[PDB]
């Protein structure tokens, strides 16, 4: 009874590993602006795969007349698909095909990620079954609770596709989402596609 | 299982003890200015080995526009490498080869440090294998939660190399890091003129 | 294992009994001015034996540029050696030979103190080993949590040596320490060596 | 082992049941003026048996220059001996022979009280050892935490001597104590000595 | 485990055969405005108080000793089968109008079953029956242990139907009076009033 | 402008010739632990209370009506020239032992002058004299209107020296007793005790 | 009449008020209450710096602790020293009395100010003003508070008649003790053994318009 | 009875206008880090001219043992003299000759500043007396209380000397001060010394 | 004395009415997101004319390293100039010629605005001199402290030029400013299709 979360980084839903039942499908949510530091926002948690997309994930429900959202915060970040996004900002409707899809599955045991911090793909531990190879992705670099090194352990630190533009911003209070100004953000670097060469590799493993 | 942290005190990653899987590698963070009293800053914890260096570790992520850092506190201290560093306070780019590197490893048991509080090397417990010899380093001397003596039990109270200037300061809101004005700080004195005054220690594990 | 703490009441470090390994050596800290009730200040706890002596044990570290101490209170009490104290208050340097030394050791079991509340030496429980005899010392007399009776069970309530002037005070924000004006403070009386006779006696025991 | 507490209601120290080791001796403290609600003040707890008597039991220690007591609270109540108390108030020194003494012992199991709520002595449960008979005394009658009924379960609800003036009051800030104005206070009544007849009876039992 | 019985008379109830009686008291139903995390169920020992007073919020019943600070004053106690006059009474006059109760050590945890019609619901398969009654549900709000979850408690099953099941006590008035509303807190069906009320049974696995 | 007189007896003082009397009461010296911004000077009307009670902190003297919440209980009243027994008394017994007072409409603001020796200090140049006394300074701390500034008040000049100038009242005890200390609050010089005390005079510009 | 003027003798003798100004009262020179609120001003130019009764606990409303219980943390107090030299050990409320400076408060016809030269010369009083005393510039409140720094210089409190190696003492409240102050020449404003220091200190004068 | 403040921007004290008495002399303090927004830090206020220099202006007094400073803040800024400052940071002692001197004077009326927001020197109002010409300096640009436009009215917005490096930073907790990294900071610009040409001019006037 | 503020709605400073000294010149700030309720953001106040534009007006000064801005709030709205602005959200440098310019002047008396709430130009009071004709603009419509009608008394409720897009938004923590999605906002409707629907006003002073 363990959860494993998969981000396709495309507009297509991923399929769960053979022998793992699909629990639900969603949209890949990376980060919620000004949340509690008491809240973990790892891509490896169920909370990063949301069944319904909306520019206001902070609201309990998506009907303002029933659940009214009080706080100031309306910026949210979502991993992106491989479709290139126009400079002109977009609305809740037109943004959908640019958002990454995801799935959550019932895993026989807890999955962990291993990292080489060089260009080699690190091996899975001795008796474990391998699930995917990736590039190391570490957003939570601050010395917070679960941060830095501890985050590297989660399936959420290993994305399958290297990307110049790994994610997009959503303004809540405005109902808009647009591409991200900075490049190569949060990719963990090593101790043209010459950028891809600078990036740590990883593998996600499970004991079955 | 159990975690074991190594600080090289150099711009070179340490190697994990033969037989212990390496989990990650980073930079040696010693202290974050003014935190929750109960939150612990020991060199023996995984939290002291950060995969990415930045002059602002208080921020959740390293992009200002994504994670805004609200609080006042922006001082951080990092183990310096064996390099001699100039009088000019530097920035997040220049400072990198001056910061100590570190590694975290999965140990088979809980490692502990022993101290002699004199100039002799204290012996490891009866059936315990030895990992390293060092000098006693005790930053947390106040009578806080897990301070003083209880800090001496930690592998983080045993650094391999003595150094006049063991660490450096980083101003967050200034994006700058300089060398530390005071010398021979946090070393635990006895009950190369200084090397003599300093307690000696050893880190052991029951394998 | 468990912890045992010894206060020599002299400027020499005590040796651990019964072949118990010595963890470390320090100075005997009795009490911190205005601590929370949540923080216990017993002479039987490791936190009473500090590796480095400083007129300001409230600071996390002993360099003020690194660790700034924010708050009002800097009165600290340390146990005294047998050396007589001069009238003139003294700074962090000159006080050192006047502070009691201590040691912490890994004990096979939990040490308790027994008290007679008369002039006789009380016996250890049946199958227990005797560690030291002394005088009953009870600072924590208030009806707090861990107070009175409860504090009597601690090894910290049994000082080996009777003393007119058992401890001393340290003004932090003044960086000074001087003898204590009151005499025979905190000793537990019976239900000028005439004073010594009014004092309850105790023994510290462990089950080995 | 568990704690069992005994209040003599005289100036003499009670003796612990045969086979039960005496941990310490003290003075019977019934009630501290306006403590936190989370604070239990049962006569069955160690906290009611204080090794040192003072008119200010709120202060951590008994030397004001070391431990300063900030809160306003200064009244405290102590069980009384059989010796008649004069109408003229008294000081910490002169009040000593009027206060009850008490003992704490290591018991083989948890002691409980059984109450009849009539004039018959209730029996101990089937295989339990009897420790003493008394009169039902229930101070904590309000509907607070471990109050009312819950308190009757305590050995502290069963005092051996019926008394018109069961306790005395101490004003802290004054350093004074005087006999209590009200009579027959806190005795649990039944569903010259016509009063004794109106009182519930109890027995303290332990499983040995 | 504990079992609480409310007689709804001025006589103390007897514990079911086989269960030792721990104590006896007065039936307290509710204390005006207590912190949400505090449960006021008639199946808890806290509902059976050894001494009655118009001020149960005070730690002790001598106010020169225990001073009660907070504003909150009213309390409600189950009433006995006694005609209650119109004059708001005092602590002494009121005693014989209060229900008495008893707490017992039960060999297992007792539960109440409810039919929510006029029939007597059956005890579960190998369970002993303790009493039949009418469904009584004060805690209807969707608070912590509220609504249905309170229905599980033996405290939701009173043996005697009454038009005036309980009374009010003003604390800082030292006064208690009959209650203005009628048929309050009885759980109705999915005296012609007795007919509208759900029936219940309290069972234990012995 | 107001002028307050404390007789230190059980007789009400007379207002100085020419000044209308507004009311009469009992001499309240001090209320245990009140917010710093509240001044307790004997030269303020608040020190002369029309009704005496062992609980002046309550808005009214019927507690079923005005409930007093805060912990603070003790009050001190100037005592009359009456031998006080050792038994702590109640609100009724204590009345004839309390000083009485009167408040008057004065044509100008009265001030007290002090000599801080044994001599009687002279009134300022064209000022009328009202009374001679002994220097009395309770408010010695360096609080708001404290120390010397309190010396300006007519409330710092009592006509009668006394070893026991005042008494204590426990609120939630309904009790008042004589005070343990002696010669308290009298201002000393820069019964052999009367000799040690500074002398004063209360003057007004009429 | 009008305004207050405060005089600190820095001796055990009470000063006399100048120019026939009436004396309102006499007392002891209180310099500073430990960690008072920033909303309370502690200048030696205010009446509150001259206390009629000396106590090692001036935070208390009155000097009988059974009546006025003082609750808060703040303990220490500083009084201006007299000319007589102190011993090394702390002393009690009784012994310390002859070591505390005396003072007086007077009714002035106008508000008195202080002028400073910020060198070794004595600065002149304003044109039509009479001089009241010469001194040495003394500035405790140097922080950038509400009425601090240069603004405190305007106060007659910034001009002490007597230069002193040891201008004040400390009193530990909850200890009931007072002792000599370790530091020397503290709070004197400098110029842009004892004889050397005196030269480095700015001079002042306190003036009033009568 | 009005105050007028003069900053020499040299290590020499300024002289007050003829006919204005000098009240005191000091060091030019521009800004205190993390102060109340309830605190005005204008160069035109008396609070900007401090008689004693120290790296910790936040402390009531300059003896830590008497007035203990509690808050985190130790950065302070001071206008500079014309002496060029070395790259190596300096201490409270050696920094002194680099700090600007100032004076406060008694003015017959309130002085105001006028600004051209171009390269011309603006004239003083019709019957007013001119005191000095300057370059417009506006630090308080935020929409705070006295900020922006309102600050322009104060004598403090008109400095006599244009400067590449108008001020220096002082770290408190470290006891150090060093030159400032940014250039031409806070100079109000217009609607080689080609920088001086871009700067608004001003004049400070008084009604006499 | 009294202050009078003019907004040009162009990249050109307005001129003060003949006879009124100019005190300073700036940029038109309309609104700061989420302030102290009692703090007033009217265009008739000197606080609406800021000498230096920046995308972060909440900060005390415009240097991050000197004045750190702690609070969350970083949205600001500024009167746009008659320029048509592209779909790209711009930065603090690009945005400048798009911001309305303004002037503050010392007026001899208190200026007020009158409104007709129809399409006619309302007349100035009897012996009052006229300053400008405009369109009624009322942002503060909530029943706050000095809102609704009482805002209409202010010279700041009368802008000279009607405009479909009267203002722009600035994200502080993003250092960006873009055009506003909604159109015809804050104009006060009647009791060039839109110009007709809009109340007309005049600003008068008693000189």
Three-class HEC string of H77-121:
EEEECCCCCCCCCEECCCCHHHECEEEEEEECCCCEEEECCCCCC
Cβ contact G143–H66 (<8 Å): no
As a residue count, chain B comes to 207
> Exposed (0-12), middle (13-18) or buried (19+): which is I39, by Cβ within 10 Å?
exposed
Angle at I156 between CA I151 and CA I160, to 5 degrees: 130
As a residue count, chain D comes to 208
Residue H140 is nearest to which of I24, I58, I60, comparing CB atoms? I60
Cβ contact B65–A34 (<8 Å): no
What distances in angstroms separate CA H208 from CA G183, H4, H132, one per listed residue?
48, 13, 15
Q: What are phi and psi of B186, to 5 degrees?
A: 65, -5
Cβ contact B72–I72 (<8 Å): no
List, in sequence order, every residue forming a beta bridge with D13; answer none if it has no partner.
Answer: none
List, in sequence order, every residue forming a beta bridge with I168; answer none if it has no partner.
Answer: I78, I179
Nearest to F16 by CA among F27, F1, F28, F3: F3
- Residue A9, Ramachandran bin (φ over 0: left; ψ between -120 and 50: alpha; else beta): left
Q: Would the CA dihedral through B146, B152, B156, B161 be positive or negative?
A: positive
> Looking at CA atoms only, how far is residue D116 from chain E in angstroms?
8
Asked if chain H contacts chain D via 3 or more Cβ pairs within 8 Å, the reply is no
Nearest to G58 by CA among D66, F76, F147, H61: F147
Sheet with B158-159, strands from edge to edge, namely B112-115, B200-205, B129-136, B158-159
As a residue count, chain E comes to 206
Buried b (16+ CB within 10 A) or exposed e, H172-189: bbbbbbbbbeeeebbbbe
Q: Is I155 helix (H, G, I), strand (E, B) or coil?
A: helix
What distances in angstroms separate CA B158 from CA B8, B141, C9, H15, I64, one per listed residue?
11, 15, 29, 62, 40
Give the contacts of C30 (CB within 8 A, at least 6 positions apart). Answer: C41, C43, C48, C77, C78, C79, C139, C167
Residues of B with CB under 8 A from a CB of C: 31, 33-34, 77, 115, 117, 125, 138-144, 147-150, 152-153, 169, 181-182, 185-186, 188-189, 191
Nearest to E82 by CA among E186, E10, E184: E10
What distances in angstroms separate CA G139 from CA E125, G41, G115, G125, H50, one per listed residue?
90, 14, 13, 19, 11
Residue C117 is nearest to which of D25, D32, D57, comparing CB atoms? D25
How far does Cα B79 stand from its chain's mean position?
A: 6
Half-sphere exposure of C145 (CA within 13 A, CB side): 9
> Given the structure tokens 């043996």, which residue do they identify?
E159
Angstrom resolution of this structure: 2.8
The two counts, helices (H) then strands (E), for chain E are 2, 12
> Looking at CA atoms only, how far is residue D68 from chain G in angstroms?
8
List, in sequence order, every residue forming a beta bridge with B90; answer none if it has no partner.
Answer: B177
Q: Is C30 helix (H, G, I), strand (E, B) or coil?
A: strand
Residue F54, both tokens? 């062992």
How far does Cα E30 stand from its chain's mean position?
A: 8
Nearest to D159 by CA among D3, D18, D30: D30
Other CB atoms within 10 A of residue H71 CB? 13
Q: Which CB contacts under 8 angstroms, 24+ apart, belong to D182-186?
A: D182/E62, D182/E64, D185/E62, D185/E65, D186/D137, D186/D138, D186/D139, D186/E60, D186/E62
Residue B193, both tokens? 């003129």
Other CB atoms within 10 A of residue H197 CB? 10
Q: What are phi and psi of B147, to 5 degrees?
A: -95, -175
Cβ contact F180–G66 (<8 Å): yes
How far does Cα F156 stand from its chain's mean position?
A: 8
Residue E55, both tokens? 């001020």
Q: Is I60 helix (H, G, I), strand (E, B) or coil?
A: coil
> Looking at CA atoms only, how far is residue C23 from chain D in angstroms?
30
DSSP F22-46: EEEEEEEEEETT--TT----TTSGG
What distances in angstroms separate CA H160 from CA H137, H156, H178, one per listed residue?
10, 11, 23
* Contact indicator for I7, I13 with CB cutoff of 8 Å: no
Other CB atoms within 10 A of residue H33 CB? 22
Buried b (16+ CB within 10 A) or exposed e, G83-99: eeebeebbbeeeebeeb
Cβ contact H25–G142 (<8 Å): no
* Contact indicator for I166, I80 with CB cutoff of 8 Å: yes
Cβ contact H72–B181 (<8 Å): no
Residues of D with CB under 8 A from a CB of F: 34, 72-73, 87-89, 174, 176, 178
Q: Closest residue of A to I72, CA-based?
A: A72
Q: Which residues of G touch F147 (CB under 8 A)?
A: 27, 47-48, 50-53
Parallel, antiparallel or unpaired: strands H2-7 and G159-160: unpaired
* Contact indicator for G59, F141 with CB cutoff of 8 Å: yes
Q: Where are the alpha helices (DSSP H) in chain B?
A: 149-152
The two counts, helices (H) then strands (E), for chain C are 1, 12
Asked if chain I contacts chain G via 3 or more Cβ pairs within 8 Å, the reply is no
Residue E60 is nearest to which of D115, D117, D140, comparing CB atoms? D140
Give CA–CA dist I110/I112, Å, rounded: 7
The two counts, helices (H) then strands (E), for chain I are 1, 12
Residue A110, both tokens? 């807890």
Parallel, antiparallel or unpaired: strands B22-32 and B101-107: antiparallel
Q: Would the CA dihedral through I58, I60, I64, I70 be positive or negative?
A: negative
Give CA–CA dist I61/I38, Å, rounded: 23
* Cα-only R_g, chain C: 17
> Looking at CA atoms only, how far is residue D7 from chain G in angstroms?
32
* Contact indicator for H173, C65 with CB cutoff of 8 Å: yes
* Contact indicator for E67, F172 with CB cutoff of 8 Å: yes
Nearest to H92 by CA among H204, H206, H172: H172
Nearest to E169 by CA among E71, E24, E59, E52: E52
* Contact indicator for F116, F195 with CB cutoff of 8 Å: no
Angle at G169 between CA G164 and CA G173, to 5 degrees: 170
Cβ contact C51–B143 (<8 Å): no
Residue H60 is nearest to which of G145, G182, G192, comparing CB atoms? G145
Give CA–CA dist A47/H171, Å, rounded: 44
List all chains that touch chain F, counting a touch as 3 or more CB pairs closer than 8 Å: D, E, G
- Residue of H36, H70, H88, H89 to mutate when probing chain B, most B C-beta within 10 A: H89
Q: Which residues of D touch C207 (CB under 8 A)?
A: none
List all chains that touch chain D, counting a touch as 3 or more CB pairs closer than 8 Å: C, E, F, G
> Looking at CA atoms only, how far is residue G71 from chain F in angstroms?
10
Give CA–CA dist E166/E182, Å, rounded: 10
Q: Which residues of D touch C138 (CB under 8 A)?
A: 51-52
Q: What are phi and psi of G89, to 5 degrees?
A: -85, 145
Cβ contact C46–B186 (<8 Å): no
Q: Where are the alpha helices (DSSP H) in chain G?
A: 150-153, 194-198
> Exposed (0-12), middle (13-18) or buried (19+): which is F2, by Cβ within 10 Å?
middle
Residue D50, both tokens? 């204080």
- Residue A97, Ramachandran bin (φ over 0: left; ψ between -120 and 50: alpha; else beta): alpha
- Residue of D1, D15, D60, D102 to mutate when probing chain C, most C C-beta within 10 A: D60
As a residue count, chain G comes to 210
> Looking at CA atoms only, how far is residue G104 from chain H in angstroms?
25
Q: Is E45 helix (H, G, I), strand (E, B) or coil?
A: helix
- Residue H133, Ramachandran bin (φ over 0: left; ψ between -120 and 50: alpha; else beta): beta
List all chains that touch chain C, counting a touch as 3 or more CB pairs closer than 8 Å: B, D, G, H
List all chains that touch chain G, counting a touch as 3 or more CB pairs closer than 8 Å: C, D, F, H
* Contact indicator for F119, F190 with CB cutoff of 8 Å: no
- Residue of B56, B58, B66, B68 to mutate when probing chain I, most I C-beta within 10 A: B68
Half-sphere exposure of G36 (CA within 13 A, CB side): 19
Give CA–CA dist I92/I78, Å, rounded: 13
Angle at I41 between CA I37 and CA I43, to 5 degrees: 160
DSSP B46-85: GGGEESS--S-TTSSSS-TTTS---SS--EEEEEBPS---
Residue G137, both tokens? 């510039």
Q: Which residues of G touch C181 (CB under 8 A)?
A: 90, 177
Residues of C with CB under 8 A from a CB of H: 64-65, 68, 70-72, 173-175
What distances in angstroms separate CA H185 from CA H199, I61, I200, one per listed residue?
11, 10, 44
Q: Which residues of B touch H178 (CB under 8 A)?
A: 89
Residues of G with CB under 8 A from a CB of C: 35, 73-74, 88-90, 177, 179, 182
* Contact indicator for A94, A55 with CB cutoff of 8 Å: no
Q: Which CB contacts under 8 angstroms, 24+ apart, belong to H86-92?
A: H86/H179, H87/B87, H87/B88, H87/H178, H87/H179, H88/B87, H88/H178, H89/B87, H89/B89, H89/H176, H89/H177, H89/H178, H90/H176, H90/H177, H90/H178, H91/H175, H91/H176, H91/H177, H92/H53, H92/H54, H92/H55, H92/H175, H92/H177
DSSP H31-66: EETT--TTS---TTSGGGEESS--S-TTSSSS-TTT
Nearest to I87 by CA among A172, A75, A89, A85: A89
Give CA–CA dist H152/I26, Å, rounded: 12
Give the contacts of G189 (CB within 8 A, at least 6 positions apart). Answer: G116, G118, G137, G138, G139, G153, G158, G201, G202, H51, H52
Other CB atoms within 10 A of residue C39 CB? 11
Q: Closest residue of A to I169, CA-based?
A: A174
> Looking at CA atoms only, how far is residue G73 from chain H in angstroms?
14
Give the contacts of H183 (CB within 8 A, at least 6 positions apart). Answer: H164, H165
Q: Largest alpha-carbon pair distance within chain D?
A: 54
Q: Which residues of H touch B34 (CB under 8 A)?
A: 72
Q: Where are the alpha helices (DSSP H) in G32-166?
A: 150-153
Nearest to G149 by CA among H160, H2, H102, H11: H102
* Contact indicator for H157, H138 with CB cutoff of 8 Å: yes
Residue G66 is nearest to which of D71, D72, D174, comparing CB atoms? D174
Q: Is D101 helix (H, G, I), strand (E, B) or coil?
A: strand
> Looking at CA atoms only, how far is residue H52 from chain G in angstroms?
7
What distances in angstroms separate CA D30 from CA D33, G25, G202, one per listed residue?
10, 51, 66
Cβ contact C149–D46 (<8 Å): yes
Q: Would the CA dihedral through A13, A19, A20, A24 be positive or negative?
A: positive
List, in sequence order, every residue forming a beta bridge with G177; answer none if it has no partner.
Answer: G92, G172
Residue B65 is nearest to which of I68, I72, I174, comparing CB atoms? I174
Other CB atoms within 10 A of residue D2 CB? 11
Cβ contact D149–E56 (<8 Å): no
Nearest to H201 by CA among H158, H141, H142: H158
Residue I174, both tokens? 């993003």
What distances in angstroms separate CA F29 from CA F41, F47, F49, one per listed residue?
7, 6, 10
Q: How many CB pairs under 8 A join C and G?
A: 18
Q: Where are the alpha helices (DSSP H) in chain A?
A: 149-152
* Contact indicator for D89, D180 with CB cutoff of 8 Å: no
Give CA–CA dist E198/G3, Å, rounded: 85
Q: Which domains does chain G have, with CATH numbers?
A: 1-210 (2.170.240.10)
* Contact indicator for G137, G203 with CB cutoff of 8 Å: yes
Parallel, antiparallel or unpaired: strands B90-91 and B176-179: antiparallel
Give CA–CA dist I148/I162, Å, rounded: 20
Nearest to H176 by CA among H100, H101, H88, H102: H88
Q: What is the DSSP letter of F62?
A: -
Give CA–CA dist I111/I44, Å, rounded: 9
Buried b (16+ CB within 10 A) or exposed e, A72-94: bbbbbbbbbbeeebeeebbeeee
């Amino acid at each position: 009874g363990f959860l494993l979360v998969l981000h396709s980084q495309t507009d297509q839903e991923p399929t769960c590993p053979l022998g793992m039942p699909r629990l639900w499908t969603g949209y890949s949510l990376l980060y919620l602006e000004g949340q509690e530091k008491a809240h973990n926002q790892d891509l490896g948690l169920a909370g990063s795969c949301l069944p319904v997309f909306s520019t206001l994930p902070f609201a309990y429900c998506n009907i303002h007349q029933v659940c009214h959202y009080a706080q100031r915060n309306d910026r949210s970040y979502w991993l992106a698909s491989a479709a290139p996004l126009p400079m002109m900002p977009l609305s809740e409707e037109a943004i959908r095909p640019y958002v990454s899809r995801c799935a959550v599955c019932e895993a026989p045991a807890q999955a962990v990620a291993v990292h080489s911090q060089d260009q080699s793909i690190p091996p899975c531990p001795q008796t474990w079954r391998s699930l995917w190879i990736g590039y190391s992705f570490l957003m939570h670099t601050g010395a917070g609770d679960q941060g830095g090194g501890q985050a590297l352990m989660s399936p959420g630190s290993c994305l399958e596709d290297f990307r110049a533009a790994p994610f997009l911003e959503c303004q809540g209070r405005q109902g808009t989402c647009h591409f991200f100004a900075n490049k190569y953000s949060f990719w963990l670097t090593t101790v043209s596609q010459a950028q891809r060469q600078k990036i740590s590799r990883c593998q996600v493993c499970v004991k079955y």
